[PDB]
Motif scaffolding. Structure first.
Motif, PDB file in Angstrom:
ATOM      1  N   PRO A 193      58.988  23.226  -5.132  1.00 15.07           N
ATOM      2  CA  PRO A 193      58.464  23.134  -3.762  1.00 15.07           C
ATOM      3  C   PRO A 193      59.275  23.930  -2.753  1.00 15.07           C
ATOM      4  N   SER A 194      60.105  24.856  -3.235  1.00 17.91           N
ATOM      5  CA  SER A 194      60.956  25.632  -2.338  1.00 17.91           C
ATOM      6  C   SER A 194      60.131  26.481  -1.377  1.00 17.91           C
ATOM      7  N   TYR A 195      59.077  27.129  -1.876  1.00 19.06           N
ATOM      8  CA  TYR A 195      58.280  28.008  -1.023  1.00 19.06           C
ATOM      9  C   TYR A 195      57.486  27.212   0.006  1.00 19.06           C
ATOM     10  N   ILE A 196      56.808  26.149  -0.432  1.00 20.05           N
ATOM     11  CA  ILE A 196      56.000  25.354   0.484  1.00 20.05           C
ATOM     12  C   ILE A 196      56.857  24.634   1.517  1.00 20.05           C
ATOM     13  N   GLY A 197      58.131  24.379   1.212  1.00 21.81           N
ATOM     14  CA  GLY A 197      59.009  23.774   2.200  1.00 21.81           C
ATOM     15  C   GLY A 197      59.229  24.666   3.407  1.00 21.81           C
ATOM     16  N   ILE A 198      59.396  25.969   3.175  1.00 19.52           N
ATOM     17  CA  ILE A 198      59.557  26.909   4.280  1.00 19.52           C
ATOM     18  C   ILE A 198      58.274  26.999   5.096  1.00 19.52           C
ATOM     19  N   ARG A 199      57.121  26.906   4.431  1.00 16.92           N
ATOM     20  CA  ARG A 199      55.848  26.944   5.144  1.00 16.92           C
ATOM     21  C   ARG A 199      55.720  25.765   6.099  1.00 16.92           C
ATOM     22  N   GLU A 200      56.200  24.590   5.684  1.00 20.04           N
ATOM     23  CA  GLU A 200      56.094  23.400   6.521  1.00 20.04           C
ATOM     24  C   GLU A 200      56.874  23.557   7.820  1.00 20.04           C
ATOM     25  N   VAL A 201      58.077  24.128   7.744  1.00 24.47           N
ATOM     26  CA  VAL A 201      58.907  24.276   8.936  1.00 24.47           C
ATOM     27  C   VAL A 201      58.252  25.227   9.930  1.00 24.47           C
ATOM     28  N   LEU A 202      57.591  26.271   9.432  1.00 23.04           N
ATOM     29  CA  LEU A 202      56.952  27.250  10.300  1.00 23.04           C
ATOM     30  C   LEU A 202      55.563  26.831  10.764  1.00 23.04           C
ATOM     31  N   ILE A 203      54.997  25.761  10.204  1.00 22.62           N
ATOM     32  CA  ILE A 203      53.631  25.369  10.534  1.00 22.62           C
ATOM     33  C   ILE A 203      53.602  23.969  11.133  1.00 22.62           C
ATOM     34  N   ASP A 204      54.100  22.983  10.389  1.00 26.65           N
ATOM     35  CA  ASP A 204      53.966  21.588  10.795  1.00 26.65           C
ATOM     36  C   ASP A 204      55.082  21.140  11.733  1.00 26.65           C
ATOM     37  N   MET A 205      56.338  21.393  11.368  1.00 25.54           N
ATOM     38  CA  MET A 205      57.482  20.964  12.173  1.00 25.54           C
ATOM     39  C   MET A 205      57.729  21.942  13.324  1.00 25.54           C
ATOM     40  N   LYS A 206      56.685  22.140  14.127  1.00 21.26           N
ATOM     41  CA  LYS A 206      56.740  23.048  15.263  1.00 21.26           C
ATOM     42  C   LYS A 206      57.141  22.363  16.564  1.00 21.26           C
ATOM     43  N   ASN A 207      57.246  21.034  16.577  1.00 24.30           N
ATOM     44  CA  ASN A 207      57.664  20.327  17.781  1.00 24.30           C
ATOM     45  C   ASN A 207      59.177  20.184  17.862  1.00 24.30           C
ATOM     46  N   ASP A 208      59.823  19.831  16.750  1.00 25.42           N
ATOM     47  CA  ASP A 208      61.278  19.759  16.725  1.00 25.42           C
ATOM     48  C   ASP A 208      61.914  21.142  16.686  1.00 25.42           C
ATOM     49  N   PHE A 209      61.259  22.105  16.041  1.00 22.40           N
ATOM     50  CA  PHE A 209      61.765  23.471  15.910  1.00 22.40           C
ATOM     51  C   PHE A 209      60.685  24.430  16.391  1.00 22.40           C
ATOM     52  N   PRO A 210      60.566  24.625  17.708  1.00 21.06           N
ATOM     53  CA  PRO A 210      59.513  25.525  18.207  1.00 21.06           C
ATOM     54  C   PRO A 210      59.733  26.976  17.823  1.00 21.06           C
ATOM     55  N   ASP A 211      60.957  27.486  17.965  1.00 16.93           N
ATOM     56  CA  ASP A 211      61.275  28.869  17.616  1.00 16.93           C
ATOM     57  C   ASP A 211      61.871  28.880  16.212  1.00 16.93           C
ATOM     58  N   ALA A 212      60.996  28.741  15.221  1.00 16.65           N
ATOM     59  CA  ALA A 212      61.387  28.702  13.819  1.00 16.65           C
ATOM     60  C   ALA A 212      60.889  29.956  13.114  1.00 16.65           C
ATOM     61  N   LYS A 213      61.802  30.667  12.471  1.00 14.42           N
ATOM     62  CA  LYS A 213      61.511  31.859  11.692  1.00 14.42           C
ATOM     63  C   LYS A 213      62.223  31.759  10.354  1.00 14.42           C
ATOM     64  N   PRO A 214      61.733  32.464   9.330  1.00 12.08           N
ATOM     65  CA  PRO A 214      62.389  32.391   8.013  1.00 12.08           C
ATOM     66  C   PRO A 214      63.827  32.881   8.019  1.00 12.08           C
ATOM     67  N   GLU A 215      64.230  33.668   9.020  1.00  4.28           N
ATOM     68  CA  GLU A 215      65.618  34.109   9.103  1.00  4.28           C
ATOM     69  C   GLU A 215      66.561  32.930   9.319  1.00  4.28           C
ATOM     70  N   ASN A 216      66.160  31.969  10.157  1.00  5.85           N
ATOM     71  CA  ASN A 216      66.980  30.806  10.476  1.00  5.85           C
ATOM     72  C   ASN A 216      66.728  29.630   9.541  1.00  5.85           C
ATOM     73  N   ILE A 217      66.232  29.882   8.335  1.00  2.00           N
ATOM     74  CA  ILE A 217      65.913  28.831   7.377  1.00  2.00           C
ATOM     75  C   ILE A 217      66.738  29.064   6.120  1.00  2.00           C
ATOM     76  N   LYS A 218      67.515  28.058   5.730  1.00  2.00           N
ATOM     77  CA  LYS A 218      68.301  28.087   4.504  1.00  2.00           C
ATOM     78  C   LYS A 218      67.761  27.037   3.545  1.00  2.00           C
ATOM     79  N   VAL A 219      67.492  27.447   2.309  1.00  2.00           N
ATOM     80  CA  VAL A 219      66.899  26.581   1.298  1.00  2.00           C
ATOM     81  C   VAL A 219      67.914  26.364   0.186  1.00  2.00           C
ATOM     82  N   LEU A 220      68.170  25.101  -0.139  1.00  2.00           N
ATOM     83  CA  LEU A 220      69.026  24.723  -1.260  1.00  2.00           C
ATOM     84  C   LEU A 220      68.121  24.096  -2.315  1.00  2.00           C
ATOM     85  N   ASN A 221      67.814  24.861  -3.356  1.00  2.00           N
ATOM     86  CA  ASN A 221      66.919  24.421  -4.416  1.00  2.00           C
ATOM     87  C   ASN A 221      67.745  24.014  -5.628  1.00  2.00           C
ATOM     88  N   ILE A 222      67.555  22.782  -6.087  1.00  2.00           N
ATOM     89  CA  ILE A 222      68.246  22.252  -7.255  1.00  2.00           C
ATOM     90  C   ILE A 222      67.222  22.139  -8.374  1.00  2.00           C
TER      91      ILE A 222
END
Ligand code: 4BW
Ligand code: 4BW
Ligand code: 4BW
Ligand code: 4BW
Lengths: 344, 344, 344, 344
Positions: A193-222
């Motif tokens: 779910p690593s890819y879909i997690g980044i999609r959620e931050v840029l689509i759904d979690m737009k109220n807590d993080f209005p200026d969200a871009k993939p540059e400012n997103i770090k993913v730790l996949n185990i």
């Protein structure tokens, strides 16, 4: 700014490696930072899981430490996957009933996350992937980080955990009474779910993080000791002109290729997107391909103490090695993530 | 600036609807604009396809009009899916060998695109989605729109077309001599290549389009009369406690749920992404659902004369209506797309 | 100003989806707005129904909540359509007597709406569609929102509900003692009363709303899982030269095509009328096509436990999804509709 | 400004009454106005028809006078409904094959309009109603009065005439090669196209008439001796509890009740709408009820010379009687309508 995502793959028993790595990571932070009561879920703004990784994701989001979740796994590992039913997996049992039972899994999950906590009671954003068998579309259980989200605000976490872990042939499909729909394993869509997690931050979690871009997103996949599936060259060379029984033995080769290729596909688009943005360091993946001899032993549903030892040993080893080398891994636990307060 | 993408889904014999709609669209532009020799592939900067959609994608990319491809489709449709093999889909035949044959399909593709055209000769960019059975990863055949691409520059289009249309059970896997690998249908990873098509413009197609963003991307996804697969509610309610015979009747229910959910997912990320930037109109989808009685007749591999008429009639009907109402559909054919010249 | 209209279609057991969607809508408003004792019928200035949708419309018009009607329908759904009679739909029975019985339906409506409430006692405007078999013209039962309307002032609500649900072959025609005329199902003239509902506001309800235009009219049409009926292409191709027994098997194909075409037409007039005034958003239609496998099981009169779960599940899922996405759906419940006081 | 609409219903041989009334009205205009070669089609801005009314509508739209069509209909009436047929209308014949033949009707219509004329060549706006059996939705053949649609510009008028006159039980469904779809009689959808004609002017014909309102619309609906259909009170009272064989004798009493009620419903909206704007005089309807004794004689497929005389006599007497009395009828032929120029 910075947004941290924790992504857990689905690996059945191999999720013990996933939780052992997180538990060992928690101990390292406690010793090195001289801290106490360290919860690994406090360092991530979103936790996404699938199959056995979904159960751990809900536990971490609930508020239980990885060490506490680690202990509950080992005790229930031999109960979720009984030795008698693991040994008996012939075709007559396969075509008559689903292997194993759902009650031991229910009791196991009940011990970790509980039996009455709902998605509106969580202080950590979560996403659990699942497939709606009744409709055919993928259903994603998630906390209401989007203020307009009113579908699963009153859905118990144990129902989402049991739905995402319902492997099509290893468990019977999970029936959710609050939705009147049967669900299957979330690995049929997004085993990683690593890819879909980044999609959620840029689509759904737009109220807590209005200026969200993939540059400012770090993913730790185990990972869960991912094994790259492929058809044997001897089988392909000699039996490509045969049907089912020989090539694609029953549904086995068709499904396994489908999930493996889809899992590879979603992994690729993540790698390609970060490559094009020159931010490939943001995707911190912690996985190790299991050797050939151990592959025959460490299967999806093997709970023998010999195989349990290897998964626990690998989790401790990778946690120590990657923390020493990967500086970006250490940067994940530099600051605690803000708690998720749902907006009403 | 504007970037136009044509995406064709994969549905075997139902691709006649895809080509009839394009053929009908070509004739409409000729009559209304009073121009002659109109090719539908001259208005797109990238053409993506899968299975039968991939074969048609290579035909338009090569330079052949949709009407010419449509004419070759009807003649070859009976040969690709003979009535002798179609009626004999019993289990004792499916369990021994794959139904149908690759030779009738090979000749159909040969008359469609050719026999010696290679990806370096194409003047239009194109995808071909496929699954590499030898390695397990998805393999995408494409023109060298990225100057660093040297894998398919010397691969014949007929090899890529047969790779993407090699359904796991309807055809034997396609062996490419130039690559020494066996390939399967591209519908296992992307039955709707509309989403992956958008990713290409922003990732690899940067030599020609440096300032490429999803705002300046318009997608014309032509459906193939997609059927939303789901488990029967009576089956789920009664047979959820069984396995692989009643529930998941052999591998059929597992694969169909997997591909449909994956196809649903990719469309969902597609719709969710455009809705985020309020540019949902950029995605133009031309597809309709088959009625229940017709869906029993219009199958994946039904080449009966009555079924062919319905697919042809649906394509002509939808092309006329959507051209009248959907202004965004008309905006696709306002200006010819610039020819793609490979960079050396 | 603004006028809100609720329109319900007729689908037999599929009306459970209509009331489940309305019931879950009530809970969402209660949960989000922190309200109590909410009624879905208090937000509409006019409620229109047909067949099983007419019975629900009468229940909401009186003042019963959608949840109470949902509970009443589930208990009586088996009683209305007994399994013994549902399974016994052979040819000798259909050629001798009407399927099922009217008394179980009479008791179901009696416990749902009552047995003594008349149209003059209602505080909410309603309109029920029916066919006057004695005269041949369509008869509409409605509250006296027109001060000059004195025909249905002193007739019981249960008679109108009984009349509109009298399917020509699934029930015997309903005889109204007060009118001395027999009546049939209201779906013979309007299965979707959305279009006729708009006409009523601009024609009959001219005293409460003197300056009424379609721009101020918003329609919330809740479907009944409508299925697009058509003759199979194989049947048309092979049997167009035959009569009755082969093509138009008895009256089945003619009555279904006539009803589907008429239902399609009235919807078409609505869409064309609204799109001409650029007010297409005013028509909010919440409906979904059944998948082919599910459509085989979910019929007009199947009250099995498995089918009932799917209808309830679809209603719960649809209400949550459309409330989140469709802003126009949420705008319906922003303010309660004014009570209807019959002018004397 | 004024907009004149001519609407013709469908009644089979009863259309001879419609054409005789139309042909006679030409004679009165010639005698009173002292002019030569007057065609009533030049006084209408839009002509709408259904079944036999559609065939006459196409003939008027082409440019032929009503008198010429009256002569053609008289000789062809016997051939369309041969006396060898209509006497052997036994149940087994109807149970096996459709009565009558399409070839005599095809030859008859060819003599009326021709075979090479198409909608794009018409200089008068027309609208022909039909139901698409392949899709289930109604299909309306019309001239390109709205330039933005292009589907019927290249369809021969004889195909639309054949499609709209394809009675489900009296003729085989008409297959249009240019559309690959089967069609049936338009009387199933709208046996009285008077109402839909008004909507066509206010929606589709917004180019020539931008400021169009129902006040400035005059409708001249010529019936075909419409007979209201109702179930016999003795049958209803005695056979209410019976099924099919007794009540709803096969599909006859269901299709007829559905057809006559829908026709009643469409006329009712026309009446109700015009009463709302107090423009009831605009709808000039010229129709009379056939007395009971001759009603059993003058059916929709009776080709006897006695019935033809009665239809001719009724049309001749109605045109003279209404012209003297109905002033609004005379105002229709005051000025010639402007020719239709298809905008390109
Ligand atoms: N999951 C979810 N959806 C909710 C909730 N409240 C309202 N909804 C609505 O229901 C729709 C369908 O939910 P789903 O999870 O069953 O299907 C989802 C899921 O299958 C997929 N999806 C969602 N988030 C995704 C993501 N981040 N990445 C990839 N796929 C994703 O796309 C579908 C459509 O998402 P959407 O946001 O446009 O529409 C939602 C959303 O508008 C809620 O609490 N949870
Ligand atoms: N397709 C292709 N790849 C080439 C070529 N020359 C060199 N390559 C390289 O081979 C790699 C693997 O090719 P693949 O098509 O077998 O796997 C691909 C394919 O499975 C998938 N992929 C590629 N483009 C995609 C897209 N637009 N959307 C979704 N998935 C996509 O991701 C994999 C990795 O792509 P990549 O561009 O990082 O690496 C390429 C690329 O660097 C060439 O001519 N074609
Ligand atoms: N329905 C009804 N009609 C009443 C009432 N009191 C007097 N009437 C009169 O009896 C006529 C016949 O009633 P109906 O409902 O059986 O036929 C109706 C019904 O078949 C149809 N109709 C009514 N309202 C409609 C509407 N809003 N949309 C579509 N069709 C509609 O048109 C017919 C005649 O329209 P109308 O309302 O001017 O005529 C009424 C009306 O003038 C009364 O209480 N109810
Ligand atoms: N009638 C027609 N439609 C055409 C043509 N070329 C393109 N179209 C388009 O195809 C759509 C469906 O055609 P249809 O005639 O098969 O269905 C039609 C017909 O069944 C019905 N309809 C059309 N005009 C009507 C009218 N004036 N009154 C009542 N019903 C009407 O509504 C449907 C939708 O009409 P629409 O104008 O929104 O969309 C058209 C229109 O945009 C054409 O030549 N004729």
């Amino acid at each position: 700014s910075e947004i941290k995502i924790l992504s857990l793959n689905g690996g059945g028993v191999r999720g013990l490696f996933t939780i052992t790595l997180l538990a060992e990571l928690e101990s390292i932070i406690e010793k090195r930072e001289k801290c106490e009561n360290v919860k690994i879920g406090d360092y991530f703004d979103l936790i996404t899981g699938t199959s056995i990784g979904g159960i751990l994701a809900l536990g971490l989001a609930s508020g239980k430490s990885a060490r506490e979740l680690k202990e509950a796994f080992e005790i229930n590992a031999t109960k979720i996957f009984p030795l008698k039913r693991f040994k008996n997996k012939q075709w007559w049992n396969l075509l008559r009933r689903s292997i194993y039972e759902s009650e031991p899994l229910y009791d196991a999950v009940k011990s970790m996350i509980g039996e009455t906590i709902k998605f509106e009671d969580l202080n950590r954003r979560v996403m659990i992937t699942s497939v709606n068998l009744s409709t055919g579309k993928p259903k994603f259980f998630k906390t209401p980080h989007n203020p307009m989200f009113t579908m699963d605000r009153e859905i118990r976490l144990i129902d989402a955990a049991m739905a995402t872990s319902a492997a099509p042939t290893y468990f019977k499909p999970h029936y959710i009474e609050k939705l009147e729909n049967y669900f299957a394993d979330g690995g049929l869509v997004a085993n990683n779910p690593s890819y879909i997690g980044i999609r959620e931050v840029l689509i759904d979690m737009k109220n807590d993080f209005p200026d969200a871009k993939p540059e400012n997103i770090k993913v730790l996949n185990i990972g869960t000791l991912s094994e790259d599936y492929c058809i044997s060259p001897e089988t392909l060379s000699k039996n490509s002109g045969k049907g089912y029984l020989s090539l694609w033995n029953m549904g086995e080769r068709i499904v396994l290729s489908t999930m493996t290729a889809n899992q590879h596909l979603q992994r690729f688009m993540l790698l390609r997107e970060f490559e094009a943005l020159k931010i490939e360091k943001n995707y911190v993946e912690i996985d190790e391909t299991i050797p050939n001899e151990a592959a025959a032993e460490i299967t999806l549903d093997n709970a023998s103490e010999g195989c349990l030892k290897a998964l626990r040993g690998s989790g401790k080893k990778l946690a120590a090695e990657r923390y020493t080398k990967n500086e970006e891994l250490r940067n994940f636990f530099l600051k605690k993530a803000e708690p998720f307060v749902p907006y009403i």
